[PDB]
Design a protein around this ligand. Structure first.
Ligand SMILES: *C(=N)[C@H](C[C@@H]1CCNC1=O)NC(=O)[C@H](CC(C)C)NC(=O)[C@@H](NS(C)(=O)=O)C(C)(C)C
Ligand SMILES: *C(=N)[C@H](C[C@@H]1CCNC1=O)NC(=O)[C@H](CC(C)C)NC(=O)[C@@H](NS(C)(=O)=O)C(C)(C)C
Lengths: 271, 299
């Protein structure tokens, strides 16, 4: 099972941010709201000149709210692809947090929010070209990615756009877009690779599925490069599974590269 | 756009998880008000052989209990069986008790599991109730007492508490009133589950999620009536569809009636031929109609 860490600390920070025709989500920490800067675009379907929109920005046209609280915007600045709004009230439920970027193959959690309303939570995996495969629709931009590591809450992702190939692109909380994509409605291209993760077969045989009977093969056919997986409990070497990688019956009709080895173990053997 | 198994947010349920231990057994309990609900097999002296719960209740001492949230203790002042559940009154009211109700989850319905190890919530994920009262979670040692919850129209329902894993890997739990789902016993037995029956309502919804995500190779120039599908379902381990009314919205947006998807089910039950539908190699009944609608269109 793909799992997500609990969302209790992140839920009270989600606000509804609207400007013009655009309604999305924002991250309310302290007296600041971080949101995707394309919320102030007069037309998100056509190319945006972000310096023109910031030149014509009228702070009184914002609508930032959480439940029955209306958060008046006192100031607005860009930071990368993110918009940072200073609001007239501190969030009394701001949790202890740090910021952090996610590398390819890693896993984190997505709190999907719909026009300011948290609705779902699920775990993701940072893909090849800096994308993730989640399930975002209209109104979910500003959805927050987070990871909790040893009593530390890390905000690691804010949603921005979906590519033409259905993959999802976002930034970190400091404004750098993962994968280097731009926040324009022009077409962009994800790369053509699969993960250490395809750990998926190691869990496929602990559950009873054993229908098992390489970096050279993996470098020229879109697979990441790779045995220290040791815990030996199922009795099958990894090159006895690297053979299965070399692609009408797996817990799934294709190879699954979404679970890190640490997760799948910390889920089968726990602790 | 994508389809993923979702879980509703867990903020209201987290402050109610506590660590409960008696002797060598440690699990989790649900702290609501001044009461903590946990599985009654925590006072059993040996959980690997048949347990006489009458004797274990006769020899329980309240001071041997260890109830705590975030390593601060709660004093147990009363222990009592309610069904397969232990109901413990504690010396402190939970100040974060959310408004809630209790209810039982029916077969085919979806809910959320907050997996907890030793009183600390570890992860959250959505699940679906199988026909024989079981679910396919990822419970390991120390996760009993993990709480199943669902929220409907801003009403928080507690619906599940974990107890045991069957021999076949299925996971068995109780509602919050001590009634074990499926009628299984809270014993270290070799009880068997039975024949799993796929939810037809859920399989149709999963195929609508495929169509919405651009996958339509399974739809052909054929459609089968409702009763004809219901007759086929009686003998192929599929539940009967009472109507096509819960799919009026999905059929309008995709342009594919349910009867066309009904024919695709009878055909795809044979097999996928290696083709995968939204990362799935066989028919999947984990997603409910409203679950699909909320993920695809918000609502
Ligand atoms: C943000 N709330 C929304 C989320 C989308 C909706 C479908 N799935 C998603 O992830 N996205 C947008 O508002 C952006 C806006 C631009 C200016 C970044 N739109 C898109 O991502 C766009 N793709 S693009 C930029 O042309 O590659 C869509 C709307 C055509 C998918
Ligand atoms: C409780 N924390 C634990 C959860 C298990 C551990 C493995 N997966 C789970 O879901 N449950 C138990 O230890 C129970 C206790 C008895 C009194 C019901 N026993 C089992 O789940 C048992 N299965 S059984 C029905 O006895 O064959 C195991 C321990 C063999 C899995």
């Amino acid at each position: 099972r793909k799992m997500a860490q609990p969302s209790g600390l992140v839920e009270p920070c989600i606000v509804r941010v609207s400007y013009g025709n655009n309604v999305l989500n924002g991250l309310w920490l302290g007296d600041e709201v971080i949101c995707p800067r394309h919320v102030i675009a007069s037309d998100t379907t056509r190319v945006i000149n972000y310096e023109n929109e910031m030149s014509s920005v009228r702070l009184h046209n914002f609508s930032v709210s959480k439940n029955n609280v209306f958060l008046g915007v006192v100031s607005a600045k860009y930071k990368g692809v993110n918009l940072v709004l200073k609001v007239n009230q501190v969030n009394p439920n701001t949790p202890e947090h740090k910021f952090k970027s996610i590398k390819a193959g890693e896993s984190f959690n997505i709190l999907a929010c719909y026009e300011g309303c948290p609705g779902s939570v699920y775990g993701v995996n940072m893909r090849s070209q800096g994308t993730i495969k989640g399930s975002f629709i209209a109104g979910t931009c500003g959805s927050v990615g987070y990871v909790s590591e040893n009593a530390t809450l890390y905000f690691v992702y804010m949603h921005h756009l979906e590519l033409g190939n259905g993959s999802h692109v976002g930034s970190n909380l400091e404004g750098e877009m993962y994968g280097g994509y731009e926040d324009q409605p022009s077409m962009q291209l994800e790369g053509t690779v699969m993960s250490d993760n395809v750990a998926f077969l190691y869990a496929a045989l602990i559950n009873g599925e054993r229908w098992v009977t390489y970096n050279t093969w993996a470098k020229t056919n879109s697979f990441t490069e790779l045995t220290d997986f040791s815990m030996a409990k199922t009795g099958q070497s990894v090159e006895k599974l690297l053979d299965s990688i070399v692609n009408g019956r797996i817990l799934y009709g294709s190879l699954c590269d979404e679970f890190t080895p640490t997760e799948v173990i910390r889920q089968m053997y726990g602790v």
